[PDB]
Amino acid sequence: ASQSIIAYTMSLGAENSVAYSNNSIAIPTNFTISVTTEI
Amino acid sequence: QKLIANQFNSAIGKIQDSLSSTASALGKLQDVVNHNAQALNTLVKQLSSKFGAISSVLNDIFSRLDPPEAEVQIDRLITGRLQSLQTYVTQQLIRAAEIRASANLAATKMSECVLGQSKRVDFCGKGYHLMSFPQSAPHGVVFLHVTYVPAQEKNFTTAPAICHDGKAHFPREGVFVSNGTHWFVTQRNFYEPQIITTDNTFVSGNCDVVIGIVNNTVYDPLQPELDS
Amino acid sequence: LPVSMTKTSVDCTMYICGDSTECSNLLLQYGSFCTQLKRALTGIAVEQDKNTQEVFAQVKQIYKTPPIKYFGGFNFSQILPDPSKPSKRSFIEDLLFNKVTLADAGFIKQRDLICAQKFKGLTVLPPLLTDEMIAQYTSALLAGTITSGWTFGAGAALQIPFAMQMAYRFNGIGVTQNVLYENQKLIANQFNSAIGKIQDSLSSTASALGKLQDVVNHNAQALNTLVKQLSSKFGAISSVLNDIFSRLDPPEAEVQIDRLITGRLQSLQTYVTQQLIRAAEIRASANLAATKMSECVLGQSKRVDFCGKGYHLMSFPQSAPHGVVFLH
Amino acid sequence: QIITTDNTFVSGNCDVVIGIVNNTVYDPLQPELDS
Ligand SMILES: *[C@@H]1O[C@H](CO)[C@@H](O[C@@H]2O[C@H](CO)[C@@H](O)[C@H](O)[C@H]2NC(C)=O)[C@H](O)[C@H]1NC(C)=O
Ligand SMILES: *[C@@H]1O[C@H](CO)[C@@H](O[C@@H]2O[C@H](CO)[C@@H](O)[C@H](O)[C@H]2NC(C)=O)[C@H](O)[C@H]1NC(C)=O
Ligand SMILES: *[C@@H]1O[C@H](CO)[C@@H](O[C@@H]2O[C@H](CO)[C@@H](O)[C@H](O)[C@H]2NC(C)=O)[C@H](O)[C@H]1NC(C)=O
Ligand SMILES: *[C@@H]1O[C@H](CO)[C@@H](O[C@@H]2O[C@H](CO)[C@@H](O)[C@H](O)[C@H]2NC(C)=O)[C@H](O)[C@H]1NC(C)=O
Ligand SMILES: *[C@@H]1O[C@H](CO)[C@@H](O)[C@H](O)[C@H]1NC(C)=O
Ligand SMILES: *[C@@H]1O[C@H](CO)[C@@H](O)[C@H](O)[C@H]1NC(C)=O
Ligand SMILES: *[C@@H]1O[C@H](CO)[C@@H](O)[C@H](O)[C@H]1NC(C)=O
Ligand SMILES: *[C@@H]1O[C@H](CO)[C@@H](O)[C@H](O)[C@H]1NC(C)=O
């Protein structure tokens, strides 16, 4: 519609909160094999 | 095995799509050529400077001025071009030190990830490093880091040890989890529940020294085959 | 470990010329020196932010801490950020920020300071990542390391009790899990007594943060030896530009002002070469610091004397001025 | 060495492994199982 230059505060990332507890562990049930390119 | 092979082939086939597009993947190899070409084009452009003389050309000075006064201005160009060549050689030495510091890292990566398996975190990919596949590149190298990324997590209730007969049972290579009613033993990186037996755990101590211990029956594969 | 440097920008017409003379027309006889110097300086300024983005921006998810703080008897009150202070730093990072005496640009207003070298054409560029963002990268790394372990650096964040996380990390050095669960209170008291002696070891001997003071001292000494070369005449009659035009006359004025212009250009080239050498040193130090962060904070390294003197268990990062401080 | 149930472990049935070979596993209890 109206493209323009905008200034903003640099975002660091998503805000996550790990549910820590005295008797809670997390074990995955699946996996994902990914290939990462390093130049 | 077939799901692992399909994920491996689908992860290879996306590298072609990621390298065919986005126009800026091999930027680190392009900057090496673009810095040397810029340093050479700066070197051919500093020959048009007079450096305080009357002409940048060396031919129209000796045919213009006499042997004595020609010298004052020939030296002004000579000490300017020698300084430009010295700056070019110094910047080329610094860039060669940078390329040496990058090539040492590339050689250590080729040693520790292509010729073996590395236990270092985030040295050869974001995850658990399985394999590394090098590929040929102009003025560089390209590594294909096969990694192991866990997914589809599930949260249970855990415990440090098990109280069977007043004895503490710690896991050997696993961890105790609970689905609400029973307790199992599970690997740390994949959900594979098993019955808590005497072969999965070991006995060390009693039931009042561990903070957070629970009560469960520890199985044994001998007493079923001993009572009958 | 030093991570970043103070970014500097140099103007040619204010350093070589005296910003009020007609010698800018004589500066074009030399040609493309200033373009190459500004390109090298902007490359250094880009690399000084690339070093911080490689060291501190490891994770992409900002992890938070639970409100109730019980981790099996361990006390992380000196590394977790203090919500009472407006800088949102920890109790250790405040001591690290009050020991490095650099010129902070946090003052609102603008007998002269050491920032009077701006008048000679030597400005200071602010970094892209502020200190309040490095303090939030450090908090996001600490809230992943305490609550998850090594799982937040290799995939999804998997929660674990800290008493079971330290029992996991004891297995990597050759110690079984039964030593922790029978002596958990002694381990927690030893960890608390070792963290409490960190601030006592940083409030003494006046040289615990010398590697972060030496880079600021070198950045000040380079600017001081750059502004001290302006008083040198390089063999001419004076170091003042209009005094040569007022004293002598055209034919011999240019034979006495090119000796100053070439000398100032040589001093600027020397400053740029020394800043390029220091940028390579700080880039090597920042690559080493990023490797140390990835191998000691985001996991457990079995290397000898890489993550401290002894068998490495865990590492905690701290935000530092122009660097990073690890707690091994 | 002989496959003697202390060098191996059991996990699932033998119909999902591609390339399995039928052999015997020597239980070291049944020769000494006099009771
Ligand atoms: C927790 O896991 C156990 C073991 O898998 C479950 O027990 C089985 O439940 C199924 C379905 O009710 C029964 O057919 C089996 O006979 C049970 N086996 C045993 C040994 O009891 C249990 O139901 C699970 N609990 C929850 C809440 O999921
Ligand atoms: C695990 O089992 C033990 C018994 O083997 C429990 O200890 C008992 O606790 C009750 C409640 O305080 C006491 O009245 C008994 O005298 C205890 N028995 C013994 C032998 O000490 C223990 O509470 C159980 N733990 C859990 C979490 O259920
Ligand atoms: C973690 O350590 C800090 C520092 O020793 C503790 O804070 C002190 O607590 C005592 C007890 O009330 C006070 O007298 C001190 O004035 C506190 N010092 C500071 C700097 O705040 C804190 O209590 C400890 N927390 C836990 C859970 O052990
Ligand atoms: C391994 O042993 C199994 C069981 O003895 C074999 O399965 C039998 O194969 C024969 C020949 O094809 C069939 O007639 C039977 O009906 C099968 N029995 C069962 C229970 O499936 C299997 O072929 C053997 N494999 C090898 C490679 O020797
Ligand atoms: C357990 O996992 C589920 C699904 O990811 C999530 O919604 C829930 O908040 C988790 N609970 C805890 C205590 O971690
Ligand atoms: C863990 O135990 C402590 C001490 O009993 C308690 O204060 C804390 O709330 C517990 N944590 C959770 C998540 O329940
Ligand atoms: C794991 O993921 C793959 C691909 O997404 C899927 O085919 C498979 O069924 C999944 N396995 C489990 C146990 O969820
Ligand atoms: C800019 O000017 C305003 C008002 O003149 C003043 O309040 C403010 O502090 C100034 N900022 C700087 C950075 O000088």
Author numbering:
A (entry chain A): 685 to 723
B (entry chain A): 917 to 1144
C (entry chain C): 724 to 833, 844 to 1061
D (entry chain B): 1110 to 1144
Authors' text:
pmcThe Omicron variant of SARS-CoV-2, the causative virus of COVID-19, was initially reported from South Africa in November 2021, and quickly became the dominant strain worldwide. Compared to the original wildtype (WT) strain of SARS-CoV-2, Omicron has 60 amino acid mutations, of which 37 mutations are in the spike protein, the target of most COVID-19 vaccines and therapeutic antibodies. 15 mutations are in the RBD, which contains the ACE2 binding site as well as the epitopes for 90% of antibodies induced by infection or vaccination.
To determine the structural basis of higher affinity of the Omicron spike trimer for ACE2, we solved the structure of the ACE2-Omicron spike trimer complex at a global resolution of 2.77 Å. Monomeric human ACE2 bound to immobilized Omicron trimeric spike protein with approximately 6-fold higher affinity (KD=2.5 ± 0.6 nM) than WT spike trimer (KD=14.7 ± 4.9 nM). The dimeric human ACE2 bound to immobilized biotinylated Omicron spike trimer (KD=0.3 ± 0.2 nM) with approximately 9-fold higher avidity than WT (KD=2.7 ± 1.4 nM). The ACE2 bound structure reveals that the Omicron spike trimer contains an unusual RBD-RBD interaction and extra interactions in the ACE2-RBD interface, both of which contribute to the higher affinity of ACE2 to the Omicron spike trimer. We suggest that in addition to destabilization of RBDs in the closed conformation, the RBD-RBD interactions that stabilize one RBD in the open up conformation within the spike trimer, may act together with the compensating mutations in the ACE2 binding site to contribute to the higher affinity of Omicron and this likely plays a role in its higher infectivity.
